[PDB]
Symmetry: C5
Subunit: 393 residues, 5 copies
């Protein structure tokens, strides 16, 4: 209308977007900063990037953008575009986007008292440290650090307000615990001036039902199968084939959980340590079974030829467990061959007792590894039952 046109013509007279809008130049300009989280779009562990949907919230007071409502009846607010009035230069310090600023520039809304509001939307990709040493039951804290790039403490007085989560859309993979904020003043090598800073710490907790069904069940089944092959009597066909099958299959296909983790050499997930330990154990079992099967089975003393190992093995055993007549004489000779088969079965009994001792060693080593893994994963996080109480449902 007429009054809106007159007001817009008046307001921009002698205005300088460069100048900071304060009545007194010696005093700071208070700016209230806050955040509104709408969606956690991605939590990428390979590159360690958290991608979120966020509305910023900046509020301040402009001294020159004031008018009297009775003189311009009907108009109570005006809106200014990006390059027409002064705006704070608030940036995310720890950004991972190719462009350092990922906010869509919308209008600034001003009312009759010169109160400016600015709520730009954006999709922010920030770099945060991802820890999967406790996978799949882990809590992640990712920081978002916002601050003015070129305005010090004596010029721009940043203030913090509590973040808004009323419009949050729950994620199917991660459960939001909270998002608290902290305001602090930092000193840099640039210059002698404190710089305010506002940091929001998004805390997420994973939902373990999908990964549970995908990994825990076949992992438990494979561990039980390995326990069986440890308990299985040593034989050529079934034992060696099953051992090599478990070894190769696990060693090749277990990387489907390693492909979701970074290569950071700060710690190891407990599931990977358990896999590696059982892998070494089953490898030792298969090599020792092959040795006791094919290397030598014709004499009971073959394995115990050194006294040094013999003493320890014995201690462990004590601690744990006419012409027609000569043709019929050739029939007696094949009977003696059956007797030699009995001798070979006695040698096999001795070597199988040794192999069962080694198998019991593999067995209780594997069970101790499983026990430490499960006691670590059960009493790991405070109020762990919550997961089984909430996620498994």
């Amino acid at each position: 209308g007429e009054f809106q046109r007159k007001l817009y013509k008046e307001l921009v007279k002698n205005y300088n977007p460069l100048e900071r809008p304060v009545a007194n130049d010696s005093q700071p300009l208070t700016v209230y900063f806050s955040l509104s989280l709408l969606q956690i779009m991605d939590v990428d562990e390979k590159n360690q990037v958290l991608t979120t949907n966020i509305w910023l919230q900046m509020s301040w007071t402009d001294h020159y953008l004031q008018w009297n409502v009775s003189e311009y009846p009907g108009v109570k607010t005006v809106r200014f575009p990006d390059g027409q009035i002064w705006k704070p230069d608030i940036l995310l310090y720890n950004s991972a986007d190719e462009r350092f600023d990922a906010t869509f520039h919308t209008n600034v809304l001003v009312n009759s008292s010169g109160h400016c509001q600015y709520l730009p939307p954006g999709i922010f990709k920030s770099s945060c440290y991802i820890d999967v040493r406790w996978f799949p039951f882990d809590v992640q804290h990712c920081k978002l650090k916002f601050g003015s790039w070129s305005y010090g403490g004596w010029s721009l007085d940043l203030q913090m307000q509590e973040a808004d989560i009323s419009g949050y859309i729950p994620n199917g993979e991660w459960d939001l615990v909270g998002i608290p904020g902290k305001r602090s003043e930092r000193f840099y090598e640039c210059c002698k001036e404190p710089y305010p800073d506002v940091t929001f710490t998004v805390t997420m907790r994973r939902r373990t039902l999908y990964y549970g069904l995908n990994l825990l069940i076949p992992c438990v089944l494979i561990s039980a199968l390995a326990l069986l092959v440890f308990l299985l009597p040593a034989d050529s066909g079934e034992k060696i084939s099953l051992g090599i099958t478990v070894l190769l299959s696990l060693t090749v296909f277990m990387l489907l959980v390693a492909e979701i983790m970074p290569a950071t050499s700060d710690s190891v997930p407990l599931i990977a340590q358990y896999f590696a330990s059982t892998m070494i154990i089953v490898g030792l079992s298969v090599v020792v079974t092959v040795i006791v099967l094919q290397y030598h089975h014709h004499d009971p003393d073959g394995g115990k030829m050194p006294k040094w190992t013999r003493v320890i093995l014995l201690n462990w055993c004590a601690w744990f467990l006419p012409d027609l007549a000569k043709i019929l004489e050739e029939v007696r000779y094949i009977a003696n061959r059956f007797r030699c088969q009995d001798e070979s079965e006695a040698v096999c009994s001795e070597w199988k007792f040794a192999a069962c001792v080694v198998d019991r060693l593999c067995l209780m080593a594997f069970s101790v590894f499983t026990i430490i893994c499960t006691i670590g994963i059960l009493m790991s996080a405070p109020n762990f039952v919550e997961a089984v109480s909430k996620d498994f449902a």
Copy 2:
């Protein structure tokens, strides 16, 4: 021509793109908003993003862009570029594009009555919740929420019109059910002002012929093969090899359907639950067959050594199913060895009866799992026959 030049010079005199074009500043400006869907370009389930081709439709009235046709004969419309006249700031709230606005800025067409039309094209990537718990027979509702970013209810009066689907190009994968819209007023933490909003709900239904041919046929064949190996008599070579082959092959290669689903731990697709249940069953079958095959086969009472299991197994069985003379005496001894072979075959008969009881257990557990899966997938969605009536064709 001369009149077009004169009109263009006249119209921009004293014009202010910032000012809202109304005769009375105290009354809202009515804007009619609508949509035109041309193509569903992608429905990505990994990142849960719907990518579509859309023409927006905004219509309003500009008070200052009016002229008399008799004074400028021949010219009936004018066109203005992006930054020369006032345009509504209509944005998609739930956007997933790196830039928050994905519309190509075209001209605004105005006629002699000051009626402005604006039809920008665009390719919109919006985030919507994808549910595959009913895969491959699922219906997806994805929302598109459009609204003015900085104009309240008292300034911009948004109105809704029915979406246009006359130019829709059918998709080969998804069948469009409808696209209805709803206009609602929301309250935010920004300020005391209602904000109008227009939401269009694109509803799609999957076409199951491709996935049917790709998955259902080999899945049915593999399930039948598993039924066979459950019904197959317990033996060393064929039974164990087939069981381990099914286990490993299914466990490794069934992820081709998991790679098309998100990791959201809100529910589980029924096909995955059926696969996991049959997987546990076949694993139990192979371990029990190995136990009854190699652990002990020299005595019928080997398996039934505890009374606690013996009573239950018995109840289940009742409920269901000179020197030459001594050489010829050694020939009698190998005949007695054949008799011991008969004794071993009797032990094998007992152990195979036990293994067949376990196999019947595996069999009817697997059939109950298949029955619940198929009864879930058959009577799942209302008017399910439509699929077989329309898609399979």
Copy 3:
């Protein structure tokens, strides 16, 4: 020079880029539109996008950009940048690029008669329907639809000229058949005005030598191997192992041709149907061979226990194909055991006749499937020999 400077100063006096350059405002402005194809850079079937290198060609007449050559001797043409003169807003309607306009904005060349030429280059990604139901011998027609976004029939009079292919660089994968164009007037829901439109239909034909060598040879070899295993006598070791190997290997690795096709459930490629049919046949063969091998081989009447199947099988067969004395009596008993082995071999002969009947069923079903596949692929497209005449070379 001096005259160029004077002319450039003169020409832009009172010029309005917004105004349409016509002497009479009541008459349309004729614009000639054409295309120049240089390279088909990609034909992506997963997302169904054709990526090409194209020079547009727009020609029109500007009424105000005229001068007298005798007054400005030496200068015959001038060039204007993007935002300094009026240009048609010609867009590709069915675009798939994230930005809806993918043309590089070059200069506009004007000569002394006010004839404007505009030849912007670009790399255009357009969405076209890809049909692989006839793979690998398929012809694809992909459309490019260009038109003015905001200028109707009464304002901009679009005209079509034949496309230029003199600079085309042949592609190694696709053979260009032609690129004809058609101009048509459309009616939209926007408004009461016809809108001209120019559509160019790029027609491509695939080159089958690479895919031929990669797929046809091993596919033929595997089909011959399957024919062998169908013709092979039923036995424990070779038959079952070969059948399961073919089944698993084909079922897992045949997806290398499915990964190049979309998931559109409109039709099925004939190669996939043939693979699925032979897959079902070989699965039935392996299950029936396992049944006749291990389920029962001790009685000839085991398989024919129901009369319903017995009658049909018989009809098919008719239509197609002292103490020392007692020890030597135990030797007679093992001779009788050899006689029982002969009885078992007779049972095996009967069961193998049945299995060979089933194998002949599998065989001629597989050959009928191969016959329909090859008769479909041979007489599919008109002038098919061209391929073997031109591509295989």
Copy 4:
């Protein structure tokens, strides 16, 4: 300083960036164009794109940007940004970047004589034809075609200078042979005017050490293994298992070299042809061995039942290579069974002679294929020894 400010104010007086800077408008403006290659960043064969790091070099003379050094003491050069003075519109015709111009716009440096230099940097992705039919010993020529888009021969007189390679950083994969340039005038369908053009042909030669160690050694080992299995006597266990293992493993895993080549059906790499030929040969060997092993082994005349094949096989062979008494009579009968075993071994000898004839056929066919492959790859390129002289080192 004062003189720099005065000079900058003077120089832009009455300046027109649109106008071509010549004293006489009837004469062309000579522009010297050259290139400086710094790094070959990528040579992608899948999409056939060469990505390089290049500094362009344009030099010309501006008539209006001249001054007297004695009047402005101390200032000898000035610099102008992108849109403030006239610059040639030099573009890469065969570009593959989404944006058609991939140069960073830097300043233009002018000295007291009005000599303008322009050296913009850039990363250029150009489309060139990649030929791998001679892989891994191939030489690639990729073209870069630069020219003025809208300035003809009578307006802009392009000239060529030799490219600069003093700052080249050697690549680990490709060895640069040269980069010669050629200037030529072209005629287009646009209009009646010649258009100058400058084309630089980057010539690269691959380094074969990495691919040598990765592929040649295991390929040679696998070929030797196939030669062994061809020379191995026909038997059930080892022969068939080894043949099927080689077939399946090679057929599945040899695509690691096909994944680095385009699908262009213009020619075939010799390594792929050799693989396919040996693949057919070994497939024929395994099928014929299975036939001679299990189809029939009870009669020597089984294989030679038709005279047509019998004559050729014979020609090839000629050209190449009381009650106790009756029980002991049953013992004589099992001795006769051993005699029938001898008869079966004679049949096996005949069938194995036939199978060894077929194996010799497979053997020398495979060796001829290897011989043609190695004679093609040895005497393929002129001065081939250079590779082994330079790359293998």
Copy 5:
């Protein structure tokens, strides 16, 4: 305030962003350049790109942007945006980003003495040479080369300051050793003018715990298994199956370490050389075992038929290691068949002695290869223990 507005109006009077801000035009303008590293975001070996997060630091003096604080009380600094004052054109020469400049343009802060500071943030992708010939224990030096594009030594006097690492965030994969800088003057083919340059050399050291646990343990286990199969007696079932399993599995799956390395044919990682050598050795072992197993086992002189090999093998051996009566005569004949079995076992003993000689050859060749590999990897880098002292922890 009033004074800020007056100062901003005053400062831009007669200002020229093009002009270099010096009081004397004949003297260079000193610019201090420095860097601040915050995070090493990626070190990509496939494309050889280092992606880092960096704040640049430029400081200089502007002659015209000076004022008296007593005249403008309260204002001590002003800030200017990108295009309003003169800024150095400092670029990264060896950039790999699609756009050659990857810095976010922030404000320039000026104080009362005309001292300009400029600290733009950015994410820089620079191309550096990645060497993995010492993987996984390698030190990488990647260069960042910054300089003025169009300002020579006589105009812009670049100076270097030590980089800042006080805000560095440690990486989980790479350990930062240092980042020293060097300033040097270069001569180009452009022109006769030295050009200053500042180069920072980021030095990183890998952390080997993750890769250690992932690769070293299974590699050691597989090498031990290969040692076993070399030491295992030659037999049909276990020996050949294990050898072929190791060969195929290693040859197929060892590429998981090759996928993290470039294809540069400058050197070979020692792990790959060791794998290839053991691969050749085990291939020779399996082929020779198959030859000695199935080719000929009926005569001890079969293998030693040429004197040339016989002499060397012997030298190596010396250097290292009524009617009833005739039926019972047929029983004597099967006893003689057992004697022929003993003869065959003697032939097997001779051939197995030969095979064990070949196995010892394979064994100590493999151990020498392992010894050279481990002695290379142990005493490779100075102060190697640091890794095991710091990384393994």
